[PDB]
């Protein structure tokens with residue numbers, strides 16, 4: 001998981017249907033990638049919360 | 058005579074001394090110090106101060122004590138320090154006489170017999186592993202007892218006296234959970250198997266940071282193909298005269314032991330060998346100058362087994378041939394956890410049912 | 426020592442600032458178990474190339490590092506259908522070089538008359554000396570249309586004036602024009618009704634090769650102002666062997682190309698602005714072309730000539746208009762060749778066999 005402070009949330013409303021939309025942005029620096037010494041390429045995934053469950057991107 | 062050799066990225070370098078003279082490296086760097094020397098894109102130039110200290114260690118292992126040398130300056134021989142930067146190899150070398158030392162790097166011979174040498178103490182844990190760094194000339198002892206789903210720390214001891222008395226110098230907090238007893242220390246860096254993965258993690262003890270993570274292809278992991286006692290000992294690491302080794306098993310070889318040489322810098326497979334011995338049937342294994350030694354032994358839970366405590370199989374990497382042996386192995390206790398060979402002292406660093414012991418070796422000149 | 430099979434480049438390097446010095450070199454086959462190929466190509470174990478030392482000395486010697494591609498680009502094939510290799514024995518010595526002989530004398534400042542030997546029976550012809558071999562031997566070839574087929578050798582200068590020849594070579598083909606030259610005991614000449622240069626070794630008295638000069642005009646198509654099938658002219662200087670000719674691609678203008686004396690291949694092509702038929706003759710010095718414009722017998726309302734009016738540099742690929750006065754006592758200038766060993770011009774002018782002295786500039790850049 002990425003720290004809460006790194007996340008920048010946006011509380012938006014859609015035109016097609018009157019429902020709560022959420023948009024989150026996270027900055028990734030060169031220093032983060034070049035200092036990462038894992039087996040695979042520096043990857044990221046998105047997890048969203050609802051009253052029924054969760055979904056991965 | 059002092060020389061200078063330069064070659065850009067993916068361009069192989071050539072080193073040759075006149076007559077029968079030997080090459081001797083003094084200073085080596087793989088990266089970028091000057092921008093106008095190499096010719097490439099201007100974006101990579103005038104922006105990076107790239108350095109690689111391990112450059113000297115790599116060149117000394119290949120070019121030194123040899124007449125001619127050819128090293129491909131790429132990811133096959135040199136690990137990438139700064140990504141997205143066109144690198145080069147700067148080497149300063151001198152020509153000196155050909156005469157080289159004996160029995161230092163050299164193989165002491167074929168194993169003739171294993172005898173009991175030292176008994177340090179009786180640890181709180183039944184399983185675990187202990188070893189020393191054979192590259193660095195120090196009396197430092199690295200200790201790591203195995204706790205299922207909880208192993209995440211390595212303990213360092215100043216001397217043999219402190220290890221028995223239980224006086225530790227420092228404890229390292231590892232970035233990942235460790236699987237099985239299979240682990241070693243190679244030139245101030247720790248190599249281990251990460252929990253629920255077929256990956257080897259490199260952790261520099263000096264900087265206390267992870268430097269790399271290598272995937273051992275098709276290797277069975279997490280109690281799939283461990284030793285007789287089990288305990289997630291699916292992947293075992295070994296150190297000998299030839300270098301760093303990985304003892305494991307693949308489903309392609311039908312659970313049989315697969316041995317692969319690993320580069321301690323680039324973290325890549327530099328050769329793969331398939332044996333006839335099943336890993337689960339074996340108790341532990343060790344490498345001595347390119348030769349695998351498979352230990353078959355009895356356990357406390359075994360109801361009078363026809364399997365005596367002896368080394369019954371050997372595999373040579375250079376010859377790619379195997380033989381059935383019968384060397385007597387110490388059986389004082391019944392739960393053999395780990396067996397590691399140290400090329401500096403030519404002894405076995407063993408863990409047998411809570412007990413931490415050292416075994417003396419008898420070598421025969423059977424090599425030719 | 427260094428060894429490399431066919432099409433495999435060889436590398437030579439001395440420690441520090443030391444220079445490479447070749448002792449023995451051979452391109453062929455002496456041993457069959459060294460290289461690894463088909464056994465049919467290894468059946469012949471007696472292939473030799475003497476010129477191997479001459480090639481290696483011109484490229485590797487007096488240098489710190491050397492890279493020579495052991496193939497047809499640098500080495501001519503001695504035995505066909507045989508997998509060859511390069512055997513070189515070399516020693517590391519100080520970085521010292523030998524002066525004056527190989528080195529450029531500078532830029533031409535003025536041409537003056539030097540020697541007058543005799544008045545030959547033929548109006549047009551060509552004479553020269555081999556600058557590579559340290560000998561006082563004079564090579565003579567008086568041009569006779571549709572009949573030139575012999576090269577005369579003279580022991581010394583005294584014998585050449587007195588008309589006392591040593592030996593006469595019977596050439597395998599008819600020669601076109603007065604453009605011939607001699608390079609290291611071998612004769613290079615333009616074969617009649619062809620754009621080809623023929624190599625003929627004087628020692629063995631046999632033809633060693635025949636090279637095709639691409640797009641070159643031949644047989645009175647684009648000769649010098651006097652004609653006489655002068656279409657292709659050969660030159661020798663500090664840079665090596667050269668071919669002065671003309672192509673229809675350059676619209677009759679002079680095209681200069683460097684030729685390898687062993688591989689017989691074009692190692693570079695340069696196009697000039699001067700028309701060959703407007704030119705009387707041309708010569709090479711330090712890789713710089715000098716165009717001669719002279720006056721001839723039968724020149725209606727004409728006096729313009731006896732000058733060097735154009736120059737072309739190969740290294741810089743730039744041209745300039747000069748005005749160096751050229752001597753023309755007799756009108757019909759037939760041949761002008763430069764000898765880098767003596768730094769003199771070998772001229773044939775309306776029956777007269779003359780040697781011209783040269784004066785050079787303080788610098789060349």
Ligand SMILES: *[C@@H]1O[C@H](CO)[C@@H](O)[C@H](O)[C@H]1NC(C)=O
Nearest residue numbers: 007008009024025026027028
């Ligand atoms: C971090 O991301 C925010 C948008 O979520 C952006 O406005 C900000 O400039 C970024 N930080 C930097 C240093 O660019």
Ligand SMILES: *[C@@H]1O[C@H](CO)[C@@H](O)[C@H](O)[C@H]1NC(C)=O
Nearest residue numbers: 081117121122157158161162
């Ligand atoms: C190899 O070369 C190194 C470079 O000095 C030298 O220290 C070493 O003793 C030589 N021999 C061996 C076995 O490493």
Ligand SMILES: *[C@@H]1O[C@H](CO)[C@@H](O)[C@H](O)[C@H]1NC(C)=O
Nearest residue numbers: 482486487522523524527528
């Ligand atoms: C170069 O090397 C050759 C080989 O012997 C030597 O004869 C010559 O004098 C040297 N110097 C020059 C300028 O060629």
Ligand SMILES: [Ca+2]
Nearest residue numbers: 293342396397
């Ligand atoms: Ca082991």
Ligand SMILES: [Ca+2]
Nearest residue numbers: 658707761762
């Ligand atoms: Ca000429």
Ligand code: NA
Nearest residue numbers: 238239240395
């Ligand atoms: Na181990």
Ligand code: NA
Nearest residue numbers: 603604605762
């Ligand atoms: Na000529």
